[PDB]
Structure 1
């Protein structure tokens, strides 16, 4: 769903369940000491951080009930505020179809039902999960985003195959946790973003094409009128395919990375 109109815009999103409740402050910044390292990003409106439970282990064997499903900035992911029988309230990112006031059990013996958050060896094949723990313990580095999913494929010994959103297949051992279902935030992607400055509500001041800069500034800089040569960034690497990975440990846990 979206808003639609005339007066010069397109497509805002729409949300239920509103609270404004309980976690740490965050503070915007771009440069890191001297010259800005991660480029642009100097704008933005005043976000706060929400501590979110990726690990979800020590709550093992303990059921919970969804309080509400809340909007969080810095996210693109619906978050469900969980409350446990323990009394402990914990923010857990909300998947598609996860209702308000549903009940989500934690722990390994919990059924592959929505949100139930179990390890892979107990997850029946083909099933869809999100928030995938990479190395047992720690937390989920995989599929934390909107509409992003992972599909379990037949395991090995302690190890399982998974199809990540990129399409790449990964070896990930079954000792790792995961959450059942895919994390929607509906379809975030088709938001229109309207006009500029909206891109500025959040990140800041997007691409400055090197081709308008000067020979001193960028490789693309210089000349008379709009043109090209080369094909390359801040430093001469290029737009198109150059494998940027280094030959490494991880690389033996990847089977058919394609796209």
Structure 2
């Protein structure tokens, strides 16, 4: 427990509620976690400890740089306490090392990957995830994202060797209700158990099931949502 900014609940913006549900809590805090990890490249550090922190589902490594400063950094599946972390293109592609893709061996399974030089990590970071490399092209690398997708990425971007783990939300069965309350307000409210007024799947004497749409009028099963833009060219194989 140490050196972290305070987090405050809030499930809606300026005026009213925006992202339904979510209201419970516990008071959790925020721990600034190094993602971009460049200003520190060129300095070795050791796993002082792996603390378990919320707002993440992902162990947290408390690294210490020769500089003297500490910096929490996601903990990949494997690092024990006391090992070594080193940033900068000059780094043995091992667990915890952060080295851009250009310098990353094909078939190498890494996470914490960015999408644009800096602004921190972005892909592969949530509890146990693995984005492996496919095979450099020109300036961009082909990689496989946890959703089974293929995106070019200019190898200019660092990455962390290895895959996160923090065990696995597989046996975590949240027991009975109220565990969800240890986190977010009573989940989903069956709009089919509301009123013609309140939502599309309202009324009906008895029990319904027609039209299939979201709280508003769109459709939820198999209706595309992404639009026509840039990244679009920079992408390969959305479906599946």
The structural deviation recorded for 1:189 is 3.5
Scaled by the length of structure 1, what TM-score is found?
Answer: 0.91
The one-character-per-residue Cα deviations of 1:208-247 (angstroms, maximum 9, x if unpaired) are 0000100000000001111111100111111211111110
Cα deviation code 1:28-58 (max 9, x no counterpart): 0112232210111111111100100001101
Give the superposition deviation at 1:25.
0.3
Which residue number in structure 1 is paired with residue 39 of structure 2? 58
**Corresponding residue SS for 2:192:** helix
Distance, in Å, in 2 between the alignment partners of 1:72 and 1:194 is 20
Deviation string 1:117-138 (CA, Å, 9 cap, x unpaired) is 1100000000000101110121
Separation in structure 2 between the aligned mates of residue 204 and residue 251 of structure 1, nearest angstrom: 36
Structure 1 outlier segments of 4+, above 3 Å: none
In the TM superposition, what is the alpha-carbon distance from 1:169 to its structure 2 partner?
0.7
Any unmatched runs of 5+ in structure 1?
1-19
Distance, in Å, in 2 between the alignment partners of 1:89 and 1:174 is 27
5+ unaligned residues in a row in structure 2: which ranges?
Answer: none
Q: Distance in 2 between matches of 1:148 and 1:95?
A: 9
**Which residue in 2 is equivalent to 1:40?**
21
Counterpart CA distance in 2 for 1:258 and 1:33 is 36
Matched residue, 1:80: 61
SS of residue paired to 1:207: coil
CA distance in 2, matches of 1:136, 1:113: 21
Q: What RMSD over aligned residues (CA atoms) do the two structures have, in Å?
A: 0.9
Deviation at 1:60? 1.1
Please state how far the C-alpha of 1:190 moved relative to its aligned partner: 2.7
1:162 to partner: Cα distance: 0.5
Q: Equivalents in 2 of 1:245, 1:33: separation in Å?
A: 26
More divergent stretch after superposition (29-38 vs 68-77): 29-38
| TM-aligned CA deviation for residue 257 of structure 1 | 2.0
Distance across 1 between alignment mates of 2:126 and 2:222:
25
Work out the CA distance in 1 between the residues paired with 2:140 and 2:17: 41
For 2:126, the equivalent position in structure 1 comes to: 145
Counterpart CA distance in 1 for 2:106 and 2:171 is 30
**1:120 aligns to 2:83 (yes or no):** no
Q: TM-score, normalised by structure 2?
A: 0.98
